[PDB]
């Protein structure tokens, strides 16, 4: 147990001003502290609360090692690749779950607040990779992707591109093109003191 | 409403020339690449040439590189392939359409298309 | 200069059945490809683009899948208006190259 009695950074996460990008999803780590996993699904606020490993329904009576709240902003349409065994842009050159996932996927739109007239073009997300990515690995090297034989000499055209692209983030979108927010907790437990509690 | 119009289609000799426009509507070419795409009556499709509206960066097809230019143009918003030296082979329907950036996503538009004949 | 090769040419079957239409690709494309459904006398209609996005105004019967350098165009139930030709075209390395085609036919 942890013996203090100290609530933990969530709103930090959840209510942060500024989202990253897919690409270079933000991580922060939760240690030495203790937090209502229940209030949240309570809230009810949320468009997708997926759990994997374990049940959502008030299970705050569990102690972790230590915690990670993975935040970052994608389209409505990729929110069913933020799990275990999926394929798509997304999940295999930006943000890679494991099979043996076990934690929580938080999703909620977010139109209002990552929309912007004209589009927001600040929301980037890899679009070519030589190979998948890794599970919770990060990515963000911004090296001209060469497809032809012919080197690219770090110049943009044809066969020569840059591997980030922006979305269109468009006001006047459709719901499987608006911004959504993600935020991806998960549980490492490990044979180490338990930093992290459910309350009392 | 975003839209595509194809225009300068004919009938032409062997050997002719013949330019082909296409006008787009509802969109700037910033940002975005051109290309022509030919359809023989019958047949598969077969990509011709494509361009880089901002830049100026062309790119073409085996088949025809030499004889064909691809062109555009910011202020009218058009884009334009000019056809020299054609020959019977290169009789088709010709299409327009666009992409984001230089490559990596789809053809989002296409006009109608104009038939090209070539014969004696 | 990368070739697509397209399977099957032609295919027959009944309406509300579940179809898949396979495109193999010469090298590595990432997922450059994009999937086109075209009507007798009518331009191409844009169905999928990088791999497996669903376009706008597209029917979400439509999906689309990539395993390694194959990719696949499936078709949860069919419809009247979903009998036509389709191709698989990559924007990958250029020349961009289409498949050689794939016609549905209504079985009777």
């Known amino acids: 147990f942890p013996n203090i009695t100290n609530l933990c950074p969530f709103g930090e996460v959840f209510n942060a001003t500024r989202f990253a990008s897919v690409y270079a999803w933000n991580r922060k780590r939760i240690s030495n502290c203790v937090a209502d996993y229940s209030v949240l699904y309570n809230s009810a606020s949320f468009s997708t609360f997926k759990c994997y490993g374990v049940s959502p329904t008030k299970l705050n009576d569990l102690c972790f090692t230590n915690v990670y709240a993975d935040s970052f902003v994608i389209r409505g349409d990729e929110v069913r690749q933020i799990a275990p065994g999926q394929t798509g842009k997304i999940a295999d050159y930006n943000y890679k779950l494991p099979d043996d996932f076990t934690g929580c996927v938080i999703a909620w739109n977010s139109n209002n607040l990552d929309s912007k007239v004209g589009g927001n073009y600040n929301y980037l997300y890899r679009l070519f990779r030589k190979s998948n990515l890794k599970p919770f690995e990060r990515d963000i090297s911004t090296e001209i992707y060469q497809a032809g034989s012919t080197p690219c000499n770090g110049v943009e055209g044809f066969n020569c591109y840059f591997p980030l692209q922006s979305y269109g983030f468009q006001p006047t979108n459709g719901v499987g093109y608006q911004p959504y927010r993600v935020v991806v907790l998960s549980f490492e437990l490990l044979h180490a003191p338990a930093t992290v509690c459910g309350p009392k | 409403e975003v839209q595509l119009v194809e225009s300068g289609g004919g009938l032409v000799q062997p050997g002719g020339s013949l330019r082909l426009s296409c006008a787009a509507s509802?969109?700037?070419?910033?940002?975005?690449?051109m290309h022509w795409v030919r359809q023989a009556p019958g047949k598969g499709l077969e990509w011709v040439a494509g361009?880089?509206?901002?830049?100026?960066?062309?790119a073409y097809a085996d088949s025809v590189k030499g004889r064909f230019t691809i062109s555009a143009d910011t202020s009218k918003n058009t884009a334009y392939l000019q056809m020299n030296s054609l020959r019977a082979e290169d009789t088709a329907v010709y299409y327009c359409?666009?992409?984001?950036?230089?490559?990596?996503?789809?053809?989002?538009?296409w006009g109608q298309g104009t038939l090209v004949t070539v014969s004696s | 200069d990368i070739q697509m090769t397209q399977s099957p040419s032609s295919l027959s079957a009944s309406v509300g059945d579940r179809v898949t239409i396979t495109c193999r690709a010469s090298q590595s494309v990432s997922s450059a490809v994009a999937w086109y459904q075209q009507k007798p006398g009518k331009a191409p209609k844009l169905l999928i683009y990088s791999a497996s996005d669903l376009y706008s105004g597209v029917p979400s019967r439509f999906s689309g899948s990539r395993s390694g350098t194959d990719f696949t165009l499936t078709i949860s139930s069919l419809q009247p208006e979903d009998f036509a030709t389709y191709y698989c075209?990559?924007?990958?390395?250029?020349?961009?190259?289409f498949g050689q085609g794939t016609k549905v036919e209504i079985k009777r």
């Open positions: 359409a666009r992409s984001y950036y230089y490559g990596g996503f789809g053809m989002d538009y």
């Open positions: 361009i880089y509206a901002s830049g100026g960066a062309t």
């Open positions: 509802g969109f700037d070419l910033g940002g975005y690449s």
């Open positions: 075209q990559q924007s990958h390395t250029y020349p961009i190259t």
